[PDB]
């Protein structure tokens, strides 16, 4: 298990742009379009990264595209970070995958919020770490995968995504 297959698990596959849990408009493996509520400037913005009249409806291959551009943001983004990089020096690779996948849901500013998770993480305080983590929007908000993610910083295992 890997951060690439750890996201399509917990992001799925939709060809045609769709709703996420908070309102805005998304499409492909998580890749969130815009935050406007029209549903045109989803298309535009749509169009504007695949480069071609696509109508709401993206191919498969156009959306493993956007997944790697967009995994490859998330960890420039955490790496480019201050507060960010030092926890993500500290991690091992199944906790690294975990961060990436905060980084990737809602994005390298929102993460970096998590003032006292993030000092929890890197002074391996992993059980209370993912009590304080629970105690947030993104807990109460996708309660499924963030219940996935923090048993992964709790455990460092991928058991959360075993048969999943
Ligand atoms: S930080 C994410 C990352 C790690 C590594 C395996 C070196 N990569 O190819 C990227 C840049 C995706
Ligand atoms: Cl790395």
Same mark, same amino acid.
């Given at each position: 298990?890997?951060?690439?297959?750890?996201?399509?698990?917990?992001?799925? *596959?939709?060809?045609?742009?769709? $709703?996420?849990?908070?309102?805005?408009?998304?499409?492909?493996?998580?890749?969130? *379009?815009? $935050?406007?509520?029209?549903?045109?400037?989803?298309?535009?913005?749509?169009? $504007?990264?695949?480069?071609?009249?696509?109508?709401? =409806?993206?191919?498969?291959?156009?959306?493993?595209?956007?997944?790697?551009?967009? #995994?490859?943001?998330?960890?420039?983004?955490?790496?480019?970070?201050?507060?960010?990089?030092?926890?993500?020096?500290?991690?091992?690779?199944?906790?690294?995958?975990?961060?990436?996948?905060? #980084?990737?849901?809602?994005?390298?500013?929102?993460?970096?919020?998590?003032?006292?998770?993030?000092?929890?993480?890197?002074?391996?305080?992993?059980?209370?770490?993912? =009590?304080?983590?629970?105690?947030?929007?993104?807990?109460?908000?996708?309660?499924?995968?963030?219940? +996935?993610?923090?048993?992964?910083? +709790?455990?460092?295992?991928?058991?959360?995504?075993?048969?999943?």
């Amino acid at each position: 298990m890997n951060i690439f297959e750890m996201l399509r698990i917990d992001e799925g *596959l939709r060809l045609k742009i769709y $709703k996420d849990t908070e309102g805005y408009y998304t499409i492909g493996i998580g890749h969130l *379009l815009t $935050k406007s509520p029209s549903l045109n400037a989803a298309k535009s913005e749509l169009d $504007k990264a695949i480069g071609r009249n696509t109508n709401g =409806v993206i191919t498969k291959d156009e959306a493993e595209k956007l997944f790697n551009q967009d #995994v490859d943001a998330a960890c420039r983004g955490i790496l480019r970070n201050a507060k960010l990089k030092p926890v993500y020096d500290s991690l091992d690779a199944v906790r690294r995958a975990a961060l990436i996948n905060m #980084v990737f849901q809602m994005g390298e500013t929102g993460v970096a919020g998590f003032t006292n998770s993030l000092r929890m993480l890197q002074q391996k305080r992993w059980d209370e770490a993912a =009590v304080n983590l629970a105690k947030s929007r993104w807990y109460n908000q996708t309660p499924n995968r963030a219940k +996935r993610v923090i048993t992964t910083f +709790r455990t460092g295992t991928w058991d959360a995504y075993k048969n999943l």
